[PDB]
């Protein structure tokens, strides 16, 4: 796995679905696919109206059985924690990668909240959260926002990549 989770607007935008949940019990893993599934407990959706109306639930989350692809591997004793899981539907089924954002609620910053809830919508049209994967990082358009921190850093904790105006975009720590 070569991949760090990305900035939380991006997650937001390429998500299918943002929710909130519990994971209620232990993975059953299919040797015979190498996915694993986690039962969830939805609590909250935050994207997906789109894809799902009143009456969709979702049960399951699934990943790769093993870390070498990715698969995820869920750190919490408490099955009373609520997670923001951010992740694709593939024939109806919610998927997640460690390249997903999935993370504790509670762990997240006020401006994060904000994010998934209200502002990061606002940003998935027009604007880009460019990551520094090259050495160089110089603004290729003025639709993007440099995304310079490795990982928990100040930029995805506390911005977002906002239009200024059609063609123009700028990081933003408010509204």
Known sequence: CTCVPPHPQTAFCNSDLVIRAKFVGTPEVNQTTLYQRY?????????????????????????????????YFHRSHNRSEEFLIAGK????????????????????????????????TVGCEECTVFPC?????????????????????????????????????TWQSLR
């Open 39 to 71: 039962e969830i407990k939805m609590t909250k959706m935050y994207k997906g109206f789109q894809a799902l109306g009143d009456a969709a639930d979702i049960r399951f989350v699934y990943t790769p059985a093993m870390e070498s692809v990715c698969g």
């Open 133 to 169: 994967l090259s050495i160089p990082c110089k603004l290729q358009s003025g639709t993007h926002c440099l995304w310079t921190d490795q990982l928990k850093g100040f930029q995805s904790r506390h911005l977002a990549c906002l239009p200024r105006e059609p063609g123009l975009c």
């Open 89 to 120: 539907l593939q024939d109806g089924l919610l998927h997640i990668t460690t390249c997903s954002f999935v993370a504790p609620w509670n762990s997240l910053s006020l401006a994060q909240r904000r994010g998934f809830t209200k502002t990061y």
